[PDB]
Design a protein around this ligand. Structure first.
Ligand SMILES: [Fe+3]
Ligand code: NA
Length: 54
């Protein structure tokens, strides 16, 4: 699955890992993260992530 970078701090949201400590099971696509999910490192909103692909 895809990976997304936090353009603030460099955290990688890896869809295969999810974010279970913050309520997100492995395999959750970035689009399906709740609108108010934030970077677990710096708190950046979803708007500050970019998908790692061409
Ligand atoms: Fe961040
Ligand atoms: Na933190």
């Amino acid at each position: 699955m895809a990976k997304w970078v936090c353009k603030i701090c460099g955290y990688i949201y890896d869809e295969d890992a999810g974010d279970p400590d913050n309520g997100i099971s492995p395999g959750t696509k970035f689009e399906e993260l709740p609108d108010d999910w934030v970077c677990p490192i710096c708190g950046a909103p979803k708007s500050e992530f970019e998908k790692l692909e061409d």
